[PDB]
Symmetry: C3
Subunit: 346 residues, 3 copies
């Protein structure tokens, strides 16, 4: 039970100890914060998943986390945020997806320059976005990652002579979809691939491993991760998306994140907020189609912009239903503990 | 008499009456709230106009209004707002323009699935936008409609195999405009067609009906709806827009809305405030051009985004002219009643 | 010293004097407010710069400045802001860049109609944007200009029969860049050309004049203008931009504005804050490429949107370091005097 949730005991114990280990704690908590987890073991496990996918991306992820963390220290950011990993997770993503969307292949070592540079912007985006969003008691989610990646990918683009990005072009014809070819086996693989694509990973073992890491911290988060991935799959089929897009988990990652967020993490989990999480996840998946189409016209991927905009929208919803309750940000940990706080004062 | 303005007395009467009839009334107010009117008779007249245009569009509007009203109830939204029609007007438009912008033409029954889905969205957009805009005492206008429409039409796009939208492409050459051919009687028809296009109707008779539906509530609103359409035409000629576009009322619907909003509804009506409505109306017509061009690159229509942004812009204007007064949201009804509050304390 | 900084002695003296001479003053201070300077001599110097570049662009600038200042008066806007020149600078840019981005060339007199119209929007954009941004004590910078320009240029486009804009298309192939041809002298000349490009002037003399106009008001502002422009050049090189783009100052004008803003104008000037301006200026140049690439898709230029977004982004940054201090809007003048307030608060 010491390796579960928050790992609040371990961190209080670490407070006494060498700073380099304390730092490694933060980097690991930073990696896990992508899926709203603050748990170093979960972090190590996720690293394994990233290494199984592609050690090059894993490395670019780690450089990101470390560089961003150093930068928050440099700029005197809130230390409680840094120890929770809140200053590492955006750049984890920036490092990984900068490598995914690079046209130069694995171990193009120069990539480490712009990865380090874009990772330094992550605490600047976070603080600035917090100055606005904390006024409505909202989180910044991965807006810093998504701004950083959109900025970097459009600044370079596919024709940059140093750091060309992969070419992305809008849909320009009706895809032929032959429904008798739809495959149960591939759809089932799509569920964990959807969770894997939260870190831009299409290996179903990696998504399997990520589900494992979440389970360790909070089974309620694990459940909503899987359900959101499923609802994304359903949304894709409902709009007749090419099957291979659904198979590659492209319909599932934004949905999965949205479902975790609303399903107990930033809303207290009741039956009502569980239904709300199902709605948000479907909504998020459709916004993903929308953002993908539109950002393809300017040669950009959607990233997790859909998850960010969808979820902020649902958190801004007010209701006279007392069973739908927004967590105070200063109180957000994980669903099982969140629900206790809510039950105490309802 | 009792069928004028806001029908306060009929509203007070209905409160004891059957649930089903009160619901009919919320829906009809929902319909009229597109033009800032809360009047069930105006609602009936507008509905007649929609049936004169295209009964398919009328049906989708009505479904939209009903689903949204029901979703606001399901989500325990504010009753005053529901009864006033404020939870139906966005989805009225969502239904109509999803039909207007469908490439599958009339009585494509499948369209009822995404219309309902997107109508369920409108209370969530309204509530989230309120949480932000109410902090400046601003209304959401048709931002929920325009967000839903934009999301829907880019998520599907012209190449969706299930729900293709109408193809929209950017301007790629100088249009040839033959000035001698300009028809005076055609510009005169453009005025009521501009008003018809508020509900995506290009039939001049339907335009006049809407003008009449508005008249019944408020003559001042009617006058500004007409002036706004006119100014749009003038802006269109000033930029050498193709005649066919002016004639189909595409330069007049946003203008018309902006003019009504500023000309007595959201600003107290004075002559200074009347001049401000004219300026806003012109500015809106021009922002319409801008948004149309830019959104066309991604295959989207402007919708009423230009009305929403311009009017919000003009409502955030501050002045040390005491005759330019912004109405408290809580005191906004229609220009004749608004004006009494201004005379009392300004 | 009477023609230094804010020229607040002259301003007080002018108060008693004929309304029209005062007006010329506000107009001249409108011109210099593009670079956050409130100084009529600076404004005249900058005006001379514009004439050196292209008198037709100079004319459209002044017309914009006048129409906007008049519109601010008409709409009963704050007098304080009008006499400081905060109601003329956005339309100065509006006018200049509407001429630069017109496909019709010099002395196309009809251009004066939409220049005037778009200049009247500038006080409206300013007031509306203030109503939002003043809640975080943020200034509007040149968002009114950039909104008005983006609206105008996209409402017309390259294929408007009356007012075609210049055709802008996105990059569609890898540029060929010959590194042995790189010229130190041209790169050195790009520094003042970058400052020139703040008012859309590619003439290195003009940009040299602009640096002089700034220096007259504030040497610290002049220094950061030069530094901001330089870091723009480094950014361009770091992404292998075509040399001619670097040479024409296209990587330096956003950078330069950001570096002046953060380097003592909107942030108190310190060690840390200087470093922060270097960081902001680099970031801003990268955002310039991003915004130019993306906006070219819809046929629009970046204007100074990058400067506006980056600088607002860095002023929304909070820190537990007391040497990184944000100036209250009501106390902002120029670095030299801003620093006094800082040491005294
Ligand atoms: C409220 C008052 C305070 C105002 C403060 C302003 C905040 C400043 C943020 C500036 C950072 C912008 C950089 C992000 C993305 C861009 O790089 C690109 C270029 O347009 N985006 C893209 O082309 C794609 C991104 C589209 C996603 C939608 C954005 C909502
Ligand atoms: C101040 C703090 C509040 C922050 C809260 C965030 C609010 C969340 C709402 C976001 C939902 C967006 C859905 C709307 C439109 C999209 O489908 C796409 C986005 O590319 N629109 C388009 O493709 C075109 C849209 C262009 C319209 C002009 C832009 C205003
Ligand atoms: C907090 C609530 C207050 C709400 C206030 C509403 C403010 C309304 C402002 C709307 C005026 C827009 C005019 C400017 C640019 C447009 O012409 C077009 C949009 O398609 N430009 C472009 O497409 C290019 C512009 C892109 C720049 C990126 C924006 C960060
Ligand atoms: C953040 C600083 C990290 C600097 C590492 C960059 C070193 C350059 O690395 C180079 O990358 C090329 C591309 O794959 C290889 O072909 C070369 O062999 C390699 O030396
Ligand atoms: C931050 C500044 C560092 C810039 C690093 C320069 C990267 C050079 O990258 C080079 O790009 C060429 C394509 O044009 C390839 O042919 C070379 O193999 C590759 O090394
Ligand atoms: C929840 C989403 C709906 C699931 C649709 C299931 C359609 C699967 O279809 C099945 O695919 C198998 C491939 O493994 C084939 O062997 C079967 O013949 C076929 O019936
Ligand atoms: C979970 C939602 C699943 C949506 C139902 C998918 C079944 C669609 O049905 C398909 O329609 C196509 C027309 O585009 C035809 O070409 C196919 O033959 C037909 O089977
Ligand atoms: C909620 C999910 C509902 C999706 C089902 C919609 C199926 C679309 O229906 C199909 O549309 C095709 C083109 O639009 C037509 O060619 C076919 O006749 C029709 O089967
Ligand atoms: C509201 C203001 C509208 C101004 C429209 C004026 C249009 C006439 O203007 C002129 O018309 C000629 C055609 O006879 C063309 O040859 C010219 O190119 C055109 O400038
Ligand atoms: C405020 C509205 C007035 C509009 C002014 C219209 C000016 C038209 O200008 C005309 O444009 C044509 C190009 O299409 C050219 O053939 C003409 O030479 C040119 O004078
Ligand atoms: C900003 C720092 C980048 C390095 C700039 C120097 C690179 C230019 O290169 C220099 O250009 C000169 C032209 O004036 C030539 O005479 C020199 O031979 C050449 O070395
Ligand atoms: C900081 C003050 C700015 C210095 C400006 C340097 C002006 C160099 O300007 C140069 O002058 C040459 C001869 O006149 C011309 O042939 C070149 O085209 C021009 O670039
Ligand atoms: C501020 C950082 C400046 C970066 C300078 C880039 C150094 C140019 O590096 C160039 O890379 C080319 C690949 O495109 C090679 O073909 C050339 O031989 C090499 O000179
Ligand atoms: O780990 C370091 C090495 O990994 C290899 O797979 C790459 O091909 C080499 O370029 C690199 O130096
Ligand atoms: O893509 C559809 C294809 O799938 C196969 O399973 C069928 O037997 C082919 O005849 C068909 O063309
Ligand atoms: O607590 C979970 C349960 O809550 C009840 O209120 C619902 O009616 C059930 O459908 C649900 O399974
Ligand atoms: O309800 C109206 C009817 O109109 C007809 O023209 C359509 O073809 C039918 O499908 C529809 O039921
Ligand atoms: O065109 C719409 C289609 O919708 C379906 O719901 C109906 O069953 C079909 O008869 C019709 O062809
Ligand atoms: O009683 C009417 C009063 O209302 C105030 O809010 C105004 O600013 C006063 O000048 C005016 O006399
Ligand atoms: O200053 C305005 C005038 O400048 C002259 O030198 C040109 O010949 C004219 O075409 C222009 O209208
Ligand atoms: O450049 C076109 C210009 O021609 C002149 O002869 C007219 O007097 C100007 O108003 C007109 O705009």
């Amino acid at each position: 039970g010491y390796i579960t949730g928050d790992m609040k005991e371990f961190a209080n114990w670490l407070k006494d100890k060498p700073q380099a280990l304390q730092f490694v704690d933060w980097v690991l908590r930073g990696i896990s914060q992508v899926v709203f987890v603050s748990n170093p073991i979960s972090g190590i496990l996720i690293l394994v998943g990233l290494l199984v996918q592609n050690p090059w991306c894993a490395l670019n992820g780690c450089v990101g986390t470390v560089v961003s963390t150093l930068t928050a220290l440099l700029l005197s950011q809130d230390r409680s945020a840094i120890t929770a990993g809140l200053q590492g997770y955006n750049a984890t993503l920036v490092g990984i997806l900068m490598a995914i969307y690079s046209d130069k292949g694995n171990y193009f070592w120069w990539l480490l320059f712009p990865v380090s540079a874009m990772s330094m912007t992550c605490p600047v985006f976070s603080s600035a976005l917090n100055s606005v969003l904390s006024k409505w008691d909202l989180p910044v989610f991965t807006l810093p990652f998504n701004m950083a990646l959109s900025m970097y990918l459009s600044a370079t683009g596919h024709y940059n002579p140093f750091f060309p990005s992969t070419l992305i072009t809008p849909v320009t014809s009706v895809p032929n979809v032959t429904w008798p070819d739809l495959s149960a086996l591939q759809l089932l693989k799509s569920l964990p691939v959807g969770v894997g694509q939260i870190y831009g990973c299409d290996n179903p073992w990696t998504g399997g491993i990520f589900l494992g890491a979440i389970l360790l911290s909070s089974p309620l988060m694990c459940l909503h991760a899987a359900i959101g991935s499923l609802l994304g799959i359903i949304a894709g089929l409902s709009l007749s998306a090419p099957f291979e897009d659904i198979y590659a988990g492209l319909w599932g990652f934004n949905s999965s994140l949205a479902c975790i967020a609303i399903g107990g993490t930033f809303m207290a989990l009741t039956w009502q907020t569980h239904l709300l999480a199902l709605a948000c996840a479907l909504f998020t998946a459709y916004l993903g189609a929308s953002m993908s189409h539109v950002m393809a016209v300017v040669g950009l991927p959607s990233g997790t912009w859909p998850f960010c905009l969808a979820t902020l929208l649902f958190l801004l919803l007010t209701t006279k239903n007392p069973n739908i309750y927004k967590m105070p940000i200063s109180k957000v940990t994980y669903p099982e503990e969140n629900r206790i706080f809510y039950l105490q004062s309802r």
